[PDB]
Amino acid sequence: FRFPFKFRR
């Protein structure tokens, strides 16, 4: 489950 927040982009 990919987080909605973008760590890099």
N, CA, C and O atoms as a MOPAC input file, in Angstrom:
PM7 MOZYME 1SCF
protein

 N      0.86200 1    -1.21700 1     0.00000 1
 C      0.00000 1     0.00000 1     0.00000 1
 C      0.88200 1     1.24500 1     0.00000 1
 O      1.41800 1     1.64000 1     1.03600 1
 N      1.02600 1     1.85900 1    -1.17600 1
 C      1.84200 1     3.06400 1    -1.31700 1
 C      1.20000 1     4.22200 1    -0.55400 1
 O     -0.00100 1     4.46500 1    -0.66800 1
 N      2.01700 1     4.93400 1     0.22500 1
 C      1.53300 1     6.06700 1     1.01100 1
 C      1.13600 1     7.24000 1     0.09700 1
 O      1.74800 1     7.41200 1    -0.95700 1
 N      0.13700 1     8.04800 1     0.46800 1
 C     -0.28500 1     9.22500 1    -0.36300 1
 C      0.77300 1    10.33400 1    -0.36900 1
 O      0.77900 1    11.19600 1    -1.24800 1
 N      1.66600 1    10.29700 1     0.62500 1
 C      2.72800 1    11.28900 1     0.75200 1
 C      3.88800 1    10.95500 1    -0.17700 1
 O      4.25800 1     9.79200 1    -0.33600 1
 N      4.45800 1    11.99500 1    -0.78900 1
 C      5.58300 1    11.81900 1    -1.70500 1
 C      6.89300 1    12.14900 1    -1.00500 1
 O      7.18400 1    13.31000 1    -0.71500 1
 N      7.67900 1    11.10900 1    -0.73600 1
 C      8.96700 1    11.27200 1    -0.06200 1
 C      9.92700 1    12.09800 1    -0.91400 1
 O     10.66000 1    12.94000 1    -0.39600 1
 N      9.91800 1    11.85000 1    -2.22900 1
 C     10.79800 1    12.57300 1    -3.15100 1
 C      9.99200 1    13.35500 1    -4.18300 1
 O     10.30800 1    14.50500 1    -4.48800 1
 N      8.94700 1    12.72100 1    -4.71900 1
 C      8.09700 1    13.36000 1    -5.72600 1
 C      6.88800 1    12.48500 1    -6.04100 1
 O      6.05500 1    12.85700 1    -6.86800 1

